[PDB]
Amino acid sequence: GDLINTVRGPIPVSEAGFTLTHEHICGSSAGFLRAWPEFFGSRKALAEKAVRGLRHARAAGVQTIVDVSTFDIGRDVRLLAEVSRAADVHIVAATGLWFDPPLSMRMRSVEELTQFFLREIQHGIEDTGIRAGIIKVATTGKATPFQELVLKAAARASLATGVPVTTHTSASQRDGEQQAAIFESEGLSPSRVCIGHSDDTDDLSYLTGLAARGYLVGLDRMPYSAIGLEGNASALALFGTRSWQTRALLIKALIDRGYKDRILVSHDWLFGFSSYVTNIMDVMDRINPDGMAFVPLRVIPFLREKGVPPETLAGVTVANPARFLSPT
Ligand SMILES: CCOP(O)(=S)OCC
Numbered sequence: 001g002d003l004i005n006t007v008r009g010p011i012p013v014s015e016a017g018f019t020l021t022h023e024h025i026c027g028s029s030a031g032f033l034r035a036w037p038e039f040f041g042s043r044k045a046l047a048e049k050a051v052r053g054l055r056h057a058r059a060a061g062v063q064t065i066v067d068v069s070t071f072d073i074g075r076d077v078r079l080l081a082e083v084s085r086a087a088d089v090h091i092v093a094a095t096g097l098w099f100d101p102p103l104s105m106r107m108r109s110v111e112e113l114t115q116f117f118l119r120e121i122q123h124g125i126e127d128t129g130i131r132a133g134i135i136k137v138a139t140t141g142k143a144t145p146f147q148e149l150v151l152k153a154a155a156r157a158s159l160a161t162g163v164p165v166t167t168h169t170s171a172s173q174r175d176g177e178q179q180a181a182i183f184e185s186e187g188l189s190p191s192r193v194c195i196g197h198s199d200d201t202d203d204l205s206y207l208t209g210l211a212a213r214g215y216l217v218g219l220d221r222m223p224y225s226a227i228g229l230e231g232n233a234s235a236l237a238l239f240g241t242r243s244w245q246t247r248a249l250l251i252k253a254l255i256d257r258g259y260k261d262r263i264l265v266s267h268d269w270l271f272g273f274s275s276y277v278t279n280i281m282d283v284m285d286r287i288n289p290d291g292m293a294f295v296p297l298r299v300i301p302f303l304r305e306k307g308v309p310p311e312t313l314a315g316v317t318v319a320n321p322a323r324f325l326s327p328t
């Protein structure tokens with residue numbers, strides 16, 4: 001019945017299966033992979049790395065990932081389609097804007113941004129015909145004036161298409177509350193919205209407050225920890241000093257408080273990464289060699305061993321993403 005758009009075209013919602021709802025093939029910038037593919041070794045090396053990673057995830061039971069790279073994360077939909085085909089894993093692509101918009105975006109009005117997001121959802125990204133299945137937005141603290149427009153434009157595009165909205169927050173600053181206020185001012189249903197990087201905080205007052213309102217809570221940085229790397233300032237700043245087990249306990253905490261239907265789980269992983277320090281990808285691959293298999297291989301058994309029922313784990317990893325992604 002319900003369909004969702006992937007980089008290989010439409011798929012039935014029921015085929016999405018075990019779905020990681022916040023991932024990247026490559027975290028980069030608009031135009032960068034085209035202008036400087038050698039940064040990644042080569043485009044071919046990048047694609048091969050991504051195919052090996054997604055095949056590993058697939059072997060662990062992952063059937064679909066949502067690549068939340070926007071235009072300004074340097075999303076390359078042809079790359080996503082190539083690797084999706086080679087690895088046989090569905091990929092849902094994104095529209096929206098993250099927190100590195102260039103001037104040609106920052107100068108735009110809410111109307112103009114709505115038109116852009118609609119173009120990528122309804123017509124296709126660039127000249128490819130590949131349609132976005134989610135809208136990615138971001139704040140890092142209080143929203144900038146431009147970020148206010150972006151969140152309103154995302155709400156309007158979601159209302160028009162039924163495609164969900166997913167967010168980057170600075171979770172320690174509780175950005176989700178302001179994001180929610182902006183979304184609701186536009187009349188967007190909280191069930192269409194995932195407040196992301198919510199596992200970057202242990203503030204369950206903040207998290208249950210959102211979940212109580214109907215928001216999905218993105219616990220989407222599972223493998224991130226610089227424990228043991230504290231001498232590496234850049235890894236420390238990006239990864240944090242909380243263990244993956246600490247992050248994973250949040251999933252249990254929300255399930256134990258009645259919020260099992262409001263949780264989405266992912267890694268925020270990537271196979272190339274040019275928007276941060278050089279060789280950050282080598283540090284990450286050492287910390288988490290399992291890549292996007294880490295959730296099914298480590299997180300889901302950890303939870304099962306803590307007594308979370310399999311039905312509940314299936315509801316979190318299959319039913320929740322399905323309900324979220326289904327245009328509504
Ligand atoms: C660690 C990854 O965080 P981000 O997806 S906000 O960076 C862009 C790839």
Ligand SMILES: [Co+2]
Nearest residue numbers: 167168169197
């Ligand atoms: Co983010």
Ligand SMILES: [Fe+2]
Nearest residue numbers: 022024068268
């Ligand atoms: Fe991300």
